[PDB]
Amino acid sequence: SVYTYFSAVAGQDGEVDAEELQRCLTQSGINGTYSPFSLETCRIMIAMLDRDHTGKMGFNAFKELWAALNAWKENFMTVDQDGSGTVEHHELRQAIGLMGYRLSPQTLTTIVKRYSKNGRIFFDDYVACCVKLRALTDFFKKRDHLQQGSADFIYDDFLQGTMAI
Amino acid sequence: SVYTYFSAVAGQDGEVDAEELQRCLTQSGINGTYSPFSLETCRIMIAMLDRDHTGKMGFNAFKELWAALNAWKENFMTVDGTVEHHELRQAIGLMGYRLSPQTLTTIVKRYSKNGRIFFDDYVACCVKLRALTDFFKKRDHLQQGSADFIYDDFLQGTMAI
Secondary structure: OHHHHHHHHOOOOOOEOHHHHHHHHHHHOOOOOOOOOOHHHHHHHHHHHOOOOOOOEOHHHHHHHHHHHHHHHHHHHHHOOOOOOEEEHHHHHHHHHHOOOOOOHHHHHHHHHHHOEOOEEEHHHHHHHHHHHHHHHHHHHHHOOOOOOEEEEEHHHHHHHHHHO | OHHHHHHHHOOOOOOEOHHHHHHHHHHHOOOOOOOOOOHHHHHHHHHHHOOOOOOOEOHHHHHHHHHHHHHHHHHHHHOOOEEEHHHHHHHHHHOOOOOOHHHHHHHHHHHOEOOEEEHHHHHHHHHHHHHHHHHHHHHOOOOOOEEEEEHHHHHHHHHHO
């Protein structure tokens, strides 16, 4: 019943903005026993799939988001050794590697320190991390024309993309 | 009594993490009638002044933040709980940012709700614009308005902010 939750909050244009996406996801109960999603997290979700640069999301893109969310949640449940509903530093760093990222120790530490609350990473931040990593990497890859692991950005292009995400 | 609010929530290390900063600012009343700052906004505030990379902020940095916050708040209260699309663009330009029409629209579209911008979002925008520009400026050695980023460095800076 993915469509039921989506259509219940979509605007007359048949799309959801971040606030409506938050409402849709919350009503769907996809987070299960974990924390519900925050508006910021949903804003990053919109950015991740915002190919039209509109701040909105149609159902086809939502379907893609839904499947990705299903996947990241499973990964969370997998690395969440204990039940708790929150993961420890080591488990987050592990999850990131599990998703295919090869980040330096310093970078992983930066990510951990931004989200850590009493040494734990809550579900909303875990997902925000997954979505933001993907969106920033997609954005970066498009400017890495020679496929070298480097990119040269013009200020206005850099600011547009990073402010959006 | 800025220090009073700060020290009331600061940790054993004399610094505040994002959650403590959120509490500090709320208890300080800087928010007034407007809606309190979100955890995300406070996280960007820390990132903006996180020179030693710890995800925490000491009082000296907080003093700088407090001054900036008060200034952006005045603009919000005197450049008009929300503002409109036309006014946000205005504020961005006034802060010295000369961006393209598309870039300004993209920024406005991320926060816009029913055509309005809430106080928390207005400030988040101000803080993020400053953090990102500082980060970018540091890689623009020739000051050409362009900057190289090695993937890992790019991710570290943008995930922190």
